[PDB]
């Protein structure tokens, strides 16, 4: 039926978007479980003077 044939088309379109949307939602969740899982895996006086030596080194450079 014309009207019916029309309705069938509209639902085919809705259904495909449903499918695409469900794929996007899954991808987002997986990406996020990759990240939150990376996020849970990567988990003295001489230091003052070190900082100084580096600063001193930068000054020398800028003047070279």
């Amino acid at each position: 039926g014309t009207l019916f044939a029309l309705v069938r088309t509209a639902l085919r379109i809705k259904t495909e978007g449903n499918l695409e949307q469900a794929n996007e939602e899954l991808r987002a969740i997986i990406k996020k479980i990759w990240k939150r899982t990376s996020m849970k895996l990567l988990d003295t006086v001489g230091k003052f003077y070190a900082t100084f030596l580096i600063q001193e080194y930068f000054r020398k450079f800028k003047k070279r």
């Binding site: 001489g46 003052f48 003077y49 070190a50 100084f52 030596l53 930068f58």
Partner: protein, 145 residues
Amino acid sequence: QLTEEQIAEFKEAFSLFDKDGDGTITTKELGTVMRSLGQNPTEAELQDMINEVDADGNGTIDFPEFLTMMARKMKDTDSEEEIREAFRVFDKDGNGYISAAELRHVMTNLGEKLTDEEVDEMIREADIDGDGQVNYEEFVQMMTA
């Protein structure tokens, strides 16, 4: 001995740790700088650090105190040991190589404004072997040159 000039360089070094500008360094502040240099010190190693430098017992480091420590450290002249500590700061991942990004990050956190080109220039001049990175020996030449 001490030049008006070295005092002023020691004050630059003091400023970096004195985040709020109030003239003293706290355990908090030392922590934020250490954390920004790669390390993660314990609340106690921080207090111990402050305590070794804190001559008057008030629980924070002022500039005379910092000056006393730095000046004294300067007269240790067998200090290839201090270059080693400087290396460790730059080499955040301990892999034995300072990348461009490692040099940049340290560089920024000491308030030092270099261009991407300047950093490239720094690495290029220091890199004796051509791998685009600075190893310990190349770093030594660089720091003593």
